[PDB]
Design a protein around this ligand. Structure first.
Ligand SMILES: O=P(O)(O)O[C@H]1[C@H](OP(=O)(O)O)[C@@H](OP(=O)(O)O)[C@H](OP(=O)(O)O)[C@@H](OP(=O)(O)O)[C@H]1OP(=O)(O)O
Ligand SMILES: [Cl-]
Ligand SMILES: [Cl-]
Ligand SMILES: [Mg+2]
Ligand SMILES: [Mg+2]
Ligand SMILES: [Mg+2]
Length: 133
Protein backbone atom coordinates (compact mmCIF):
# COMPACT_ATOMS: atom_id res chain seq x y z
CA UNK A 1 0.00 0.00 0.00
CA UNK A 2 1.09 3.61 -0.74
CA UNK A 3 -0.04 6.90 0.82
CA UNK A 4 -0.24 10.65 0.18
CA UNK A 5 1.44 12.96 2.74
CA UNK A 6 -1.88 13.31 4.64
CA UNK A 7 -2.01 9.48 5.14
CA UNK A 8 -4.77 8.83 2.53
CA UNK A 9 -4.20 5.51 0.69
CA UNK A 10 -3.38 6.15 -3.03
CA UNK A 11 -5.68 4.41 -5.57
CA UNK A 12 -6.54 4.45 -9.30
CA UNK A 13 -9.68 3.24 -11.13
CA UNK A 14 -11.20 3.41 -14.64
CA UNK A 15 -14.70 4.04 -15.92
CA UNK A 16 -14.52 1.16 -18.45
CA UNK A 17 -16.90 2.17 -21.32
CA UNK A 18 -17.94 -0.16 -24.18
CA UNK A 19 -17.38 2.61 -26.80
CA UNK A 20 -16.49 6.32 -27.30
CA UNK A 21 -20.31 6.95 -26.82
CA UNK A 22 -19.68 6.45 -23.02
CA UNK A 23 -23.25 5.02 -22.60
CA UNK A 24 -22.42 1.62 -20.93
CA UNK A 25 -19.82 1.01 -18.17
CA UNK A 26 -18.33 -2.24 -16.71
CA UNK A 27 -18.77 -2.77 -12.93
CA UNK A 28 -17.33 -5.71 -10.91
CA UNK A 29 -18.57 -7.52 -7.77
CA UNK A 30 -17.34 -6.44 -4.27
CA UNK A 31 -14.78 -8.95 -2.79
CA UNK A 32 -16.33 -8.59 0.74
CA UNK A 33 -20.02 -8.76 -0.49
CA UNK A 34 -20.31 -10.34 -3.97
CA UNK A 35 -24.03 -9.31 -4.40
CA UNK A 36 -22.84 -5.62 -4.52
CA UNK A 37 -21.23 -3.75 -7.50
CA UNK A 38 -18.14 -1.46 -7.48
CA UNK A 39 -15.98 0.45 -9.98
CA UNK A 40 -12.83 -1.63 -10.61
CA UNK A 41 -9.73 -0.07 -9.02
CA UNK A 42 -7.12 -0.42 -6.31
CA UNK A 43 -3.91 0.67 -4.64
CA UNK A 44 -1.03 2.30 -6.54
CA UNK A 45 2.34 0.53 -6.10
CA UNK A 46 5.50 2.44 -5.10
CA UNK A 47 6.61 4.90 -7.87
CA UNK A 48 3.68 3.69 -10.09
CA UNK A 49 2.12 6.38 -12.38
CA UNK A 50 -1.63 6.69 -11.59
CA UNK A 51 -2.57 5.97 -15.30
CA UNK A 52 -0.44 2.74 -15.15
CA UNK A 53 -2.03 1.65 -11.82
CA UNK A 54 -5.53 2.33 -13.27
CA UNK A 55 -4.93 0.09 -16.36
CA UNK A 56 -3.28 -2.65 -14.22
CA UNK A 57 -6.11 -2.73 -11.62
CA UNK A 58 -8.87 -2.97 -14.29
CA UNK A 59 -6.94 -5.83 -16.03
CA UNK A 60 -6.66 -7.67 -12.63
CA UNK A 61 -10.25 -6.98 -11.39
CA UNK A 62 -12.37 -6.79 -14.61
CA UNK A 63 -10.29 -8.71 -17.23
CA UNK A 64 -10.49 -5.91 -19.86
CA UNK A 65 -7.96 -3.81 -21.82
CA UNK A 66 -8.41 -0.83 -24.15
CA UNK A 67 -7.55 2.79 -24.98
CA UNK A 68 -6.86 4.96 -21.90
CA UNK A 69 -8.66 8.32 -22.14
CA UNK A 70 -8.88 11.44 -19.96
CA UNK A 71 -8.45 11.81 -16.19
CA UNK A 72 -11.98 12.57 -14.86
CA UNK A 73 -10.75 13.66 -11.42
CA UNK A 74 -9.30 12.76 -8.02
CA UNK A 75 -11.93 11.55 -5.49
CA UNK A 76 -11.66 11.10 -1.69
CA UNK A 77 -13.47 8.67 0.63
CA UNK A 78 -13.23 10.45 4.04
CA UNK A 79 -14.44 7.42 6.13
CA UNK A 80 -11.97 4.89 4.54
CA UNK A 81 -9.22 7.58 4.07
CA UNK A 82 -8.33 6.93 0.41
CA UNK A 83 -7.80 9.13 -2.66
CA UNK A 84 -8.53 7.70 -6.14
CA UNK A 85 -7.43 8.91 -9.62
CA UNK A 86 -10.36 8.03 -11.97
CA UNK A 87 -9.74 7.67 -15.76
CA UNK A 88 -11.91 6.90 -18.79
CA UNK A 89 -10.95 3.60 -20.53
CA UNK A 90 -12.55 2.60 -23.87
CA UNK A 91 -12.64 -1.24 -23.73
CA UNK A 92 -11.35 -3.00 -26.90
CA UNK A 93 -10.31 -6.45 -25.45
CA UNK A 94 -12.47 -8.68 -23.13
CA UNK A 95 -10.50 -11.60 -21.58
CA UNK A 96 -12.44 -14.80 -20.67
CA UNK A 97 -10.44 -15.74 -17.51
CA UNK A 98 -8.69 -13.00 -15.49
CA UNK A 99 -6.81 -12.82 -12.16
CA UNK A 100 -9.82 -12.06 -9.87
CA UNK A 101 -12.22 -14.45 -11.78
CA UNK A 102 -9.74 -17.34 -11.17
CA UNK A 103 -8.71 -16.29 -7.60
CA UNK A 104 -12.01 -15.08 -5.94
CA UNK A 105 -14.77 -15.67 -8.61
CA UNK A 106 -15.21 -11.91 -9.15
CA UNK A 107 -18.12 -11.09 -11.57
CA UNK A 108 -18.42 -8.26 -14.16
CA UNK A 109 -21.46 -6.71 -15.92
CA UNK A 110 -22.24 -3.82 -18.34
CA UNK A 111 -24.57 -1.07 -16.97
CA UNK A 112 -26.15 1.96 -18.66
CA UNK A 113 -24.61 5.00 -16.83
CA UNK A 114 -27.92 5.80 -15.02
CA UNK A 115 -28.11 2.13 -13.77
CA UNK A 116 -24.41 2.13 -12.63
CA UNK A 117 -25.16 5.29 -10.55
CA UNK A 118 -28.25 3.51 -9.06
CA UNK A 119 -26.41 0.28 -7.94
CA UNK A 120 -23.38 2.24 -6.54
CA UNK A 121 -25.39 4.83 -4.50
CA UNK A 122 -26.08 2.82 -1.27
CA UNK A 123 -22.60 1.45 -0.34
CA UNK A 124 -20.31 3.49 -2.71
CA UNK A 125 -21.80 7.02 -3.10
CA UNK A 126 -18.32 8.48 -3.94
CA UNK A 127 -18.07 5.97 -6.86
CA UNK A 128 -21.60 7.03 -8.00
CA UNK A 129 -20.19 10.64 -7.95
CA UNK A 130 -17.47 9.57 -10.49
CA UNK A 131 -20.27 9.68 -13.17
CA UNK A 132 -21.75 13.13 -12.15
CA UNK A 133 -19.92 15.19 -14.91
O1 LIG B 1 -12.72 -3.12 3.87
P1 LIG B 1 -13.75 -3.55 2.87
O2 LIG B 1 -15.19 -2.91 3.07
O3 LIG B 1 -13.75 -5.07 2.44
O4 LIG B 1 -13.31 -2.80 1.53
C1 LIG B 1 -12.11 -3.17 0.87
C2 LIG B 1 -11.02 -2.16 1.21
O5 LIG B 1 -11.50 -0.83 0.91
P2 LIG B 1 -11.68 0.32 2.04
O6 LIG B 1 -10.18 0.83 2.09
O7 LIG B 1 -12.68 1.25 1.39
O8 LIG B 1 -12.16 -0.35 3.38
C3 LIG B 1 -9.78 -2.52 0.41
O9 LIG B 1 -8.72 -1.62 0.67
P3 LIG B 1 -7.82 -1.76 2.01
O10 LIG B 1 -8.65 -1.36 3.20
O11 LIG B 1 -7.57 -3.34 2.04
O12 LIG B 1 -6.44 -1.05 1.70
C4 LIG B 1 -10.10 -2.50 -1.10
O13 LIG B 1 -8.92 -2.78 -1.82
P4 LIG B 1 -8.34 -1.76 -2.99
O14 LIG B 1 -8.20 -0.33 -2.45
O15 LIG B 1 -7.00 -2.49 -3.38
O16 LIG B 1 -9.38 -1.83 -4.20
C5 LIG B 1 -11.11 -3.56 -1.35
O17 LIG B 1 -11.38 -3.68 -2.74
P5 LIG B 1 -11.15 -5.01 -3.63
O18 LIG B 1 -10.98 -6.20 -2.77
O19 LIG B 1 -12.46 -4.96 -4.50
O20 LIG B 1 -9.89 -4.71 -4.52
C6 LIG B 1 -12.39 -3.18 -0.63
O21 LIG B 1 -13.37 -4.19 -0.93
P6 LIG B 1 -14.72 -3.94 -1.78
O22 LIG B 1 -14.48 -4.87 -3.06
O23 LIG B 1 -15.87 -4.54 -1.01
O24 LIG B 1 -14.78 -2.46 -2.28
CL1 LIG C 1 -20.66 2.81 -24.60
CL1 LIG D 1 -15.28 4.85 -2.51
MG1 LIG E 1 -9.54 -3.12 -5.78
MG1 LIG F 1 -7.26 -4.95 -6.95
MG1 LIG G 1 -6.21 -4.20 -4.24
Amino acid sequence: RTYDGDGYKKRAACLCFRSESEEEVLLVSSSRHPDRWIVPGGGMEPEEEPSVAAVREVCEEAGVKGTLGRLVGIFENQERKHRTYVYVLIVTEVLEDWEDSVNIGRKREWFKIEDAIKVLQYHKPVQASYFET
